Design a protein around this ligand. Sequence first.
Ligand SMILES: Nc1ncnc2c1ncn2[C@@H]1O[C@H](COP(=O)(O)OP(=O)(O)OP(=O)(O)O)C[C@H]1O
Ligand SMILES: [Mg+2]
Ligand SMILES: [Zn+2]
Lengths: 99, 149, 125, 422, 298, 739, 99, 54
Amino acid sequence: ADFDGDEMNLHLPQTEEAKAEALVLMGTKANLVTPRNGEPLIAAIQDFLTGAYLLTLKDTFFDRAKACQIIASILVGKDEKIKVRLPPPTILKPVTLWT
Amino acid sequence: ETLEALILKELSVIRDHAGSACLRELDKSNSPLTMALCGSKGSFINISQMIACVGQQAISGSRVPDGFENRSLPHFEKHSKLPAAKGFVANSFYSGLTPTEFFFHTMAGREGLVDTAVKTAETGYMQRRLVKSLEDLCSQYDLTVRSST
Amino acid sequence: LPKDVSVAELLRELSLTKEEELLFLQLPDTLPGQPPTQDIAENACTLADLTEGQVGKLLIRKSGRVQLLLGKVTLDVTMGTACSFLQELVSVGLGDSRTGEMTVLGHVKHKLVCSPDFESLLDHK
Amino acid sequence: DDPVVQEIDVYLAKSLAEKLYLFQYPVRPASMTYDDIPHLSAKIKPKQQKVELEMAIDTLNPNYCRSKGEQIALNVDGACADETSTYSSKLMDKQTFCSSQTTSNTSRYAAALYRQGELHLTPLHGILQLRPSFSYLDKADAKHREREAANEAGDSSQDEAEDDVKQITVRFSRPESEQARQRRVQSYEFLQKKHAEEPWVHLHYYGLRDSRSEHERQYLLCPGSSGVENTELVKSPSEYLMMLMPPSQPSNVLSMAQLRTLPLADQIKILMKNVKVMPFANLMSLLGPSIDSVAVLRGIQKVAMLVQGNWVVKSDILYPKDSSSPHSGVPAEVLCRGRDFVMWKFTQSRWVVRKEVATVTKLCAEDVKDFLEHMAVVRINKGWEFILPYDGEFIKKHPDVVQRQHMLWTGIQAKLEKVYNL
Amino acid sequence: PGTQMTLKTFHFAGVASMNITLGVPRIKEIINASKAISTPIITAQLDKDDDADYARLVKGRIEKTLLGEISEYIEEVFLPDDCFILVKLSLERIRLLRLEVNAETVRYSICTSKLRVKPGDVAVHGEAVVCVTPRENSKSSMYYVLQFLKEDLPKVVVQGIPEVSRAVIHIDEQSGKEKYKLLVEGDNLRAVMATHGVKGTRTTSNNTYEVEKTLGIEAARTTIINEIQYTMVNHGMSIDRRHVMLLSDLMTYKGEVLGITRFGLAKMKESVLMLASFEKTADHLFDAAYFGQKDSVC
Amino acid sequence: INVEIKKIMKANEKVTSDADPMWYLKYLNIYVGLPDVEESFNVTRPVSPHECRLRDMTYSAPITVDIEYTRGSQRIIRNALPIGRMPIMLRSSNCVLTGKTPAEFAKLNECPLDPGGYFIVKGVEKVILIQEQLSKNRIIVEADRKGAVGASVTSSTHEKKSRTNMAVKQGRFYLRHNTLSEDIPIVIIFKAMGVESDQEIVQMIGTEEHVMAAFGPSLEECQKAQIFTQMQALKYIGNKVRRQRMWGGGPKKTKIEEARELLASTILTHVPVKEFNFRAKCIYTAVMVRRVILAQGDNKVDDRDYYGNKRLELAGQLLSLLFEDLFKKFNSEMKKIADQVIPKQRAAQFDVVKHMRQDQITNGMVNAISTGNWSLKRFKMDRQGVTQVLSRLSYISALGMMTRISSQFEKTRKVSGPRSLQPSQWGMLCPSDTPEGEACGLVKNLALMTHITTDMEDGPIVKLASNLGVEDVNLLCGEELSYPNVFLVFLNGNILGVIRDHKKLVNTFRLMRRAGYINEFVSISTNLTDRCVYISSDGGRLCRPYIIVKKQKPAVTNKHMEELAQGYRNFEDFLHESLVEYLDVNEENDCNIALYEHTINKDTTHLEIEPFTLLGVCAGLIPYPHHNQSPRNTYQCAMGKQAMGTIGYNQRNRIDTLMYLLAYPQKPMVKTKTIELIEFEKLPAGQNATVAVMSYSGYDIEDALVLNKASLDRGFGRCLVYKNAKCTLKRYTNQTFDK
Amino acid sequence: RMTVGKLIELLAGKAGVLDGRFHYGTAFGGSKVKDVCEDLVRHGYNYLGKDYVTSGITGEPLEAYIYFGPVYYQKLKHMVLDKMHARARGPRAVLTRQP
Amino acid sequence: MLLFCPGCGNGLIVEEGQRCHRFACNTCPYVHNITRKVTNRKYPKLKEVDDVLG
RNA sequence: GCUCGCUUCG
Ligand SMILES: Nc1ncnc2c1ncn2[C@@H]1O[C@H](COP(=O)(O)OP(=O)(O)OP(=O)(O)O)C[C@H]1O
Ligand SMILES: [Mg+2]
Ligand SMILES: [Zn+2]
């Protein structure tokens, strides 16, 4: 898909057995790789590759506030019941910066 | 054909050298270059086409055929095998394309479109046949693949 | 055999030799004249309406130009299709209503084409 | 490129105008001629010219097969019938050449005899192409068919007297439908029968080697002086071009040539309607120098007015009495009044304010804009300026016209002050 | 991958010639198992891969050479005593192309499927002169059948395999050694393997039918696998070998290469309902009703 | 409606029955009049097109005709008798909308910017698309399925169209036609058409050594049989002739006659025989054989996609054919009624006036325009999709759909041979504008500056050609056709003759066309490969205006443009003064055109007026299109055909089944000159928004965009959807009504 | 997609709305980039469209300049309201009892 | 080569008479005996020695 | 409600 007007279909099974078979065999987490060559299809895409690339660049250096904000940006849903585990900073004597 | 290959080689030399020069002169933090390095979208070829120089327009893996008599367009001389008269695009997308270069680019785009249009139906029929033939096989419990019979 | 030209043709026909030659020239549909007392209308004026005597001059200019001055206008004469088959110009004279005479006048070898110089007729007026 | 040499004269001869034919053999090269071949006869028709030559060919020559000659002679004719035989002897001796008509009219074709310093032209009465006809094979097939019929009748040695009395099979002369009658008329058999209806004419052959050939060859010449001015052939190049090319039979619809074909008044009216602003010199240049200036002036005085030395088309010309504003739909009289007010403001001052005109004339913005665009241009910080500069030359040359236009503008100003209450 | 394949061009596989069908048409020709395919390619290995003379010799041995391609002039001479056709062989071009063809080999080439020319008609006068004197066959044929010979005398095969149309000398420029192989655009693998100087043990082909008929069903399966994998790699997309192995095994499990078309599917499958649903509904249904074939639900 | 209909009426002016002769029905003059409505009881009334849209009726005018006939052998004349109803195209000559001011358009509830040119039938707007087809009466050399390079010629006259082919399947040429049981050798046909000598046949084919070597087998096969005369060849042909399923009437030994009639009339209809003289037909088939022989060597196979061999049929020609068919059917029905009524009824003399049904032509026209399927049995033409519903999505949508062109291929399969963008489409058709999908490449749009030619009289063309030294083909043998300097001159597929020094002929013809003695749409081209001078004068050809360049300087100067701007001259004055001339594809194939002034060199004959005219109407909306990719331009055209915006000034009174309007439409800030030309800025179909190109919140990953809530709250993007709900209360046969 | 024409249109539209003009995007011509750059630099804006922008969420300036400008966006007839579809049991066909 | 009869223009074939081989036409008794040698070369194109690629 | 055609959509 490319989100330029694609119309997609959505079906609702009417049987518990069909629902369980769909969840098990056709689960999104259970079909992360194509059967053609085993390569993973469900992966990062545009605006996720560039964002992670700019994030992991050597020029990046974040203070405590920005790093804490970026880390907390993911603490939603099932991640609301886990500790943050703020990593120790790399540079600390001149300025405390998190890469 | 030897002359055609040599002219294509020279045009490709111009294209790749202009692309290398553009990539070397470009500074970091450039959004097209940044998106090309990480591979999210685009590549160095698209950057070279949109900045430095568009490549040779190739139809069916060859230069633009002579639609008219002994020439592609009446704007060029007869029996003229010059690069600009056969599909080469000296200007880039930034500087703007001449009417002949734009026409050749539209020809290439329409060729790609009709190729994809034929490919869709051809592969649909091939997939239908292959699935109708292969849908009977299944992996048994004795590690032996057996048919329905 | 190289393709000859009308100027050199006439030059070799008169300077190189003196023997007479039979030619077959194609005149335009309408000549630049009027049918003299032929009971009319701007109709076609062919050789059947003109009388005997001098009707025009043949000019050979430099660079190979061959023109035919038929009065106020000037046509141009070019070489026609180079025929190689036999062409016999004969005279079939039916002197009597029951018996006539066929007189072989000669042989036809070259063909000429006379055309109006439309460029001059246009730049004139 | 002057005519340096070869000033050859062209003479015309009418002695053999109706007796000159052109025979060309498409299958015989010019190298081999029929001068040595003894001819026997020539059939011909005056109307619907189609000549058939009947010549004789030798037999004792090594290039003739006597066995095949006997075979073809026995095939075409009977054993010893000889009542209607295509060959006198038992060998193929006579050859038939048939003519095909190239074109119906041959007036544009002429034979040219060249002599020292002169070229004599003679019209051609007809041109035919002579090709070797294959007519003996048709008679051979007919004779083979009759021999097959004879063999069928000869199945029995003695044939009883057949009671094959011809019962009266007189068919109805049915009234033929016009379509079927046209089909019968256009049929090839009908045309061939119509051609055969014309009787044949027999002619003897006189070869080039005969003295009669050189005797009659002089008829292609004409007795006349070397220099004679032809009474005809004196038409101008324009007349010749008209002869050889006979004719078939927004408001700017009419072109320049169609304009020039119209009377002078219509020309001036259409030009003033199209341009609406033009000097007098430009009008004289467009109409042509061959037209007198007084006539052009009188014509333009009826459809134009004088503004700052230039001529502007009248309001009623652009807007007829039955027309209306394309933008507002107001009657054409209001448009004429507004345009007259605009022209008066331009005569009074070169700069005209659009807002003042819109306020005085009480018209919409688009009508005032269309009125101004016809005769003015927008100058920043100055308003609307007349498109053409002050032409004082025409004013100095024609003071009486200036005074007439001045009193006309005085009357128009009086009318405008009465209407708009200026 | 068929949708992923772009159906590109210019992929001459390094020879800059010999246009070969690759992509979706190639996959279709492979899965259809047609007896005759478009642009068949045969790769032949040489015993002497380093010598170019031996390569050109075996090329001339395998490549079909017509009489007109080697003869410098063929003239129909009508002498006053008899009329005959004289063919002059260009021995210079023969030794240039290294063809083992002399006047006797040319004479033996004639009298083979040419209006039954008797051996006495063809004769040899010089070292490279062939004289052909045809005779009337009385079957609507006279001496003026000479022209007929002029139409097909240069089109007779004197050396090479008739099925072979064109063979080229491909070279591999490996840093260790540059070896020579034969690329044959023909449809006869047995003849190529049987020719002298060709290492038949390492000769492959693109036409699966020829491989099946010549080297068995397993060689056909291996050829199918290799060709499908090569065609897939040519477009940059990779497929696990197990899929193509399963496809080849399904195509080669009854002892004969059966295609994916309706005929091969009918020969493989037995279920009437599937045969009817795929193609030829009415025909298959009426045939089943005639045979009374009971169809299970397996 | 002004010329062609009168010619059709003249062609069928008199109709009579075979029974009871001296009776006839003679048409004198036919009129179409002004559009009216038959609502009033036996009274007509002027009706506007918008009223026809509202009332779900047709916008037509009564076709009447004045006639004279014989009732009881006494001549009775009618001066005004209606016979049908012709649907009136909008903005035509008889349409009420022409010659109207925008105020008068407002009075009639019609948009002044409406392009018009579409029919209104039963309330719906139908547009007849421009049909594209191959040119008729032209030799086409093409390869067959087995690779054999053969020839085909579709000789089409006003009555019959016959495609005859020639093959080389066995080294010899066979001629194939639908009227022959088996293809016969070409030499037998040569012998049947008058020329019996084989030497003349060979001279007509060609004198080249390879030509004789290729034609040898045909001569040998002909000599194998005993065919040596015209009668034998005609008998052999007649043996290969099959009757058209027991044609009514006694044959009476018509075999040779049927063969000669098929050779004269059925085979090569476009080549005319004066009186059973096949000389021109012999020369034509000899030239065809020579072309096949020359093409059998170097693969110079002609291509079908070359638009120089394409013809465009507008609504005029289609309506002319339809009206001719309907009038012939009406005349046949009248003749049948006469034959059935007159000979047995009574002493009360039968008159056609009591039987002239007026609903025939009306219903035929209405059905053909509405349903869109045209079935002409007289021409055996079964076409579909001729008319399409005019799309009222936006002004740009209708303006682009009005200039559409459909292909003869009539897409059902993957041809991928006409779908390519040929270089011949330069200046004529828009390269980028094409529907993205299955119809890619077969539905096209005309360029901004283009024109379609009409038919000419073809008389002065022949006269000028004969006066320019063109020798008659009947005067010389075919050997002259093999000379290198002799060039054949054609005329609409007919061999006009031969000529030498064709440069002078072409220059004189072009100068005469520029002078005005020859129609400016008559095209002349030269093919040096085949050595053929083609003179095209038929209609449907695409022509483009070009500025004439003489000696490295264009004829158009700054003074001429100043006079044009001031109003001294118009485009017709540029045409008459030999400044700008129309060039056809075949003619521009031989001409040298310069894009700009700086590109003009010594060998230049014409100058491009404006390069941006290459794009069409939809492509004109693209700002800076030369800086973008071609698929982007195609997608932009496709989406602009669906762009939402205002339709016209009468969009409020207009009631359609589906209408989309924009609340606050705004004209673009970056507008092309094409936008100003088509007046798109008066009816915009979009809004200018302050776009910032950046990544925000990851909700714009693939092609998505993030909108501002406050912007949408203040009216940005607000749209209106108008739907129609129609109901009918009709009276049935019984005296009861829906209430 | 290499849509440099979109960037050129944005720049020309920004220059036009700054100086009150209507720039032309004519094919094989139109207003050049140098003219709109001079128009931008004359009005006090950047000659490349990129402007200093502060993030609305965090209130801190962005590290990279944002490309702002007026673009002529057009809405299409394809709406989610008309394309949204949901099917209950509903009716069936008479011939084959299917939806 | 292709030869034609000067008499009627039909194609000439080669046959054997009573003394020598002669050209003859099938529709007329015209014949032509052969005196000296007659030849018609064609010079077919030589199979160009193909080169090794790679 | 059946059919067909056009049209779009990805
Ligand atoms: N006929 C069709 N068959 C199957 N899928 C189609 C068809 N038409 C469109 N699609 C859907 O739309 C997608 C085609 O988009 P794609 O061709 O990859 O980009 P695009 O249309 O070339 O866009 P650009 O022109 O590259 O901007 C893929 C497919 O799921
Ligand atoms: Mg999509
Ligand atoms: Zn003969």
